[PDB]
Design an enzyme around this catalytic site. Structure first.
Site, short mmCIF file in Angstrom:
data_model
loop_
_atom_site.label_atom_id
_atom_site.label_comp_id
_atom_site.label_asym_id
_atom_site.label_seq_id
_atom_site.Cartn_x
_atom_site.Cartn_y
_atom_site.Cartn_z
N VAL A 146 0.82 -1.20 0.00
CA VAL A 146 0.00 0.00 0.00
C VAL A 146 0.87 1.27 0.00
O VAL A 146 0.37 2.39 0.04
CB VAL A 146 -0.99 -0.05 1.21
CG1 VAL A 146 -0.71 1.05 2.20
CG2 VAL A 146 -2.42 0.00 0.72
N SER A 198 5.47 2.61 -0.41
CA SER A 198 6.91 2.36 -0.23
C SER A 198 7.72 3.65 -0.26
O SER A 198 7.19 4.74 -0.48
CB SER A 198 7.44 1.40 -1.30
OG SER A 198 8.55 0.69 -0.80
N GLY A 199 9.03 3.52 -0.03
CA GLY A 199 9.90 4.67 -0.02
C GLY A 199 11.18 4.46 0.77
O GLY A 199 11.49 3.34 1.18
N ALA A 200 11.93 5.54 0.98
CA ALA A 200 13.19 5.46 1.71
C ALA A 200 13.00 4.94 3.14
O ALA A 200 13.83 4.16 3.65
CB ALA A 200 13.85 6.82 1.74
N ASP A 243 1.34 11.36 11.44
CA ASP A 243 2.72 11.68 11.11
C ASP A 243 3.25 12.89 11.84
O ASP A 243 3.18 14.02 11.35
CB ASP A 243 2.87 11.89 9.58
CG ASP A 243 2.05 10.87 8.75
OD1 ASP A 243 2.19 9.64 8.95
OD2 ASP A 243 1.28 11.32 7.87
C1 SB2 Z 1 8.92 9.62 5.67
S1 SB2 Z 1 7.73 9.03 4.41
O1 SB2 Z 1 7.16 10.22 3.49
C2 SB2 Z 1 6.48 8.06 5.20
C3 SB2 Z 1 5.17 8.01 4.63
C4 SB2 Z 1 4.17 7.25 5.27
C5 SB2 Z 1 4.45 6.51 6.49
C6 SB2 Z 1 3.43 5.75 7.16
N1 SB2 Z 1 3.71 5.07 8.32
C7 SB2 Z 1 2.49 4.49 8.66
C8 SB2 Z 1 2.39 3.77 9.87
C9 SB2 Z 1 2.22 2.33 9.92
C10 SB2 Z 1 2.13 1.67 11.17
C11 SB2 Z 1 2.22 2.43 12.38
F1 SB2 Z 1 2.14 1.81 13.61
C12 SB2 Z 1 2.38 3.83 12.34
C13 SB2 Z 1 2.47 4.49 11.11
C14 SB2 Z 1 1.46 4.88 7.66
C15 SB2 Z 1 0.03 4.55 7.55
C16 SB2 Z 1 -0.84 4.64 8.73
C17 SB2 Z 1 -2.23 4.33 8.60
N2 SB2 Z 1 -2.74 3.97 7.40
C18 SB2 Z 1 -2.00 3.88 6.27
C19 SB2 Z 1 -0.59 4.16 6.30
N3 SB2 Z 1 2.12 5.67 6.69
C20 SB2 Z 1 5.80 6.59 7.02
C21 SB2 Z 1 6.80 7.36 6.39
#
Ligand code: SB2
Length: 351
Positions: A27, A29-31, A165
C-alpha cells in the site's frame, strides 16, 4: 509475545510477520521502508503494517527510530494515532535488525474530504474540535507536533479525525521551498526561524486548516518563504515593538523593519458570511506573537464548540519523558533501547 512468524515476498520486499496478520497487500513504499494493508485476526481491525527499511544505519536514524517508537508507544488518545503492535522476527538483540509498526489502517486524510469543496459550519466545528482535543492531549505531554496540515489528518466517513505523522522526528528542512503545502501551515516564527518556537506553532496551524475548511481555499499559499510572510502580515499586521524584541536574529529584525507597517485586517471581511463565532476563534488562533495565541485547552472552551465541548471528555496525557532527546549514545545503544521498547510493548485492551 513470540508467536509464529511466516515470511513472504511482496513487491520484492521480504515480510516476516506473525500469523495474526493476514492478507497483506502493498500500500506504499519509499526510503523509510514499506507499508502494507492487512487484516489483524486478533483485533479484527484492518491495519497498516510498516516495515522500517534499515532503522539503525546511522546514529541519527537509530535515534529517529527510537523516537518514533517511544512517541507512538505513548500516544493513547482517540484523536491521535496510536500503536496497535510492534514486533521483530529477531529472536535476540544480536540479530535484531528489523522493526515493524502496526496501526489502524487510515483511509482518507482531511486533504481529500476538503480539497473537494468548502464545508458546512457544523462540519468545521466538529473537525477542528477533534484536532484541538487531540492537540490538548499532545501538548499536555510537552509534545509539539510542528507539522499539522491536512495531509497529516486522517478522517473517516463519519468525520472522525486522528492526528498523524508527527513532526517530532525529521529535522525541518529540504521540502519547504517554493509553492508547497508543506509550508503553508507553518507559523512565521518557526518558518523563518525568528525564535525558539513553543506549542502555539501548532495552534497557528489549526487556524490555517480551519480557515481553509471554511473558505475552501488555502489561507497563505505563498510561492516562497518571503512571499508567504508577506501574505501573513497583510492579514495579521506587521510586528510591533513588543514582538520585535522577541525575534532573536538581528537580520530578521532588520528585515521585518524594512517592511511598510500594516494593521491587522478585519477578519469578518475576509471570512465572508462565516459564523461570527468561527471568525472570533480564528482571530485568537492567528495572532502574530506566539505568546498571545490561544491554547488548545482554551480553544476547546470557546463558544464555537459549545455543541461538543465537555471538559470531562477531553483528557490529558501521562508525563512524557524526553530526556533521551539530549542523550549522547552510540548506534548500538540507540539500537538496544529500541529493542527494549519493542520487546516490552504491551498491547491496548480490547473493549
Ligand atoms: C517519511 S515518508 O514520506 C512516510 C510516509 C508514510 C508513512 C506511514 N507510516 C504508517 C504507519 C504504519 C504503522 C504504524 F504503527 C504507524 C504508522 C502509515 C500509515 C498509517 C495508517 N494507514 C496507512 C498508512 N504511513 C511513514 C513514512
Amino acid at each position: 509475545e513470540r508467536p509464529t512468524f511466516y515470511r513472504q515476498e511482496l513487491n520484492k520486499t521480504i515480510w516476516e510477520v506473525p500469523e495474526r496478520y493476514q492478507n497483506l497487500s502493498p500500500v506504499g513504499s519509499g526510503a523509510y521502508g514499506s507499508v502494507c494493508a492487512a487484516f489483524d485476526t486478533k483485533t479484527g481491525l484492518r491495519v497498516a503494517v510498516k516495515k522500517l527499511s534499515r532503522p539503525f544505519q546511522s546514529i541519527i536514524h537509530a535515534k529517529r527510530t527510537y523516537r518514533e517508537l517511544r512517541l507512538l508507544k505513548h500516544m493513547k488518545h482517540e484523536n491521535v494515532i496510536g500503536l496497535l503492535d510492534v514486533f521483530t522476527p529477531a529472536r535476540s538483540l544480536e540479530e535484531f535488525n528489523d522493526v515493524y509498526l502496526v496501526t489502524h489502517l487510515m483511509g482518507a486524510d482531511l486533504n481529500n474530504i476538503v480539497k473537494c469543496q468548502k464545508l458546512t459550519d457544523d462540519h468545521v466545528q466538529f473537525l477542528i474540535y477533534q484536532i484541538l482535543r487531540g492537540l490538548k492531549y499532545i501538548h499536555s505531554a510537552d509534545i509539539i507536533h510542528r507539522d499539522l496540515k491536512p495531509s497529516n489528518l486522517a478522517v473517516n466517513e463519519d468525520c472522525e479525525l486522528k492526528i498523524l505523522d508527527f513532526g517530532l522526528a525529521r529535522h525541518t528542512d529540504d521540502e519547504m521551498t517554493g509553492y508547497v503545502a508543506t509550508r503553508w501551515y507553518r507559523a512565521p516564527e518557526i518558518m523563518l526561524n525568528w525564535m525558539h518556537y513553543n506549542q502555539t506553532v501548532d495552534i497557528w496551524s489549526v487556524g490555517c486548516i480551519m480557515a481553509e475548511l471554511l473558505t475552501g481555499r488555502t489561507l497563505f499559499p505563498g510561492t516562497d518563504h518571503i512571499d508567504q510572510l508577506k501574505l501573513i502580515l497583510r492579514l495579521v499586521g506587521t510586528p510591533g515593538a513588543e514582538l520585535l524584541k522577541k525575534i532573536s536574529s538581528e537580520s530578521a529584525r532588520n528585515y521585518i523593519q524594512s517592511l511598510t507597517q500594516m494593521p491587522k485586517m478585519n477578519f469578518a471581511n475576509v471570512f465572508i458570511g462565516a459564523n461570527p463565532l468561527a471568525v472570533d476563534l480564528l482571530e485568537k488562533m492567528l495572532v502574530l506573537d506566539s505568546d498571545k495565541r490561544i491554547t488548545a485547552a482554551q480553544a476547546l472552551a470557546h463558544a464555537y464548540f459549545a455543541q461538543y465541548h465537555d471538559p470531562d471528555d477531553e483528557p490529558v496525557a501521562d508525563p512524557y519523558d524526553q530526556s533521551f532527546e539530549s542523550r549522547d549514545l552510540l548506534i548500538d545503544e540507540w539500537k538496544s533501547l529500541t529493542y527494549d521498547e519493542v520487546i516490552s510493548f504491551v498491547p491496548p485492551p480490547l473493549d
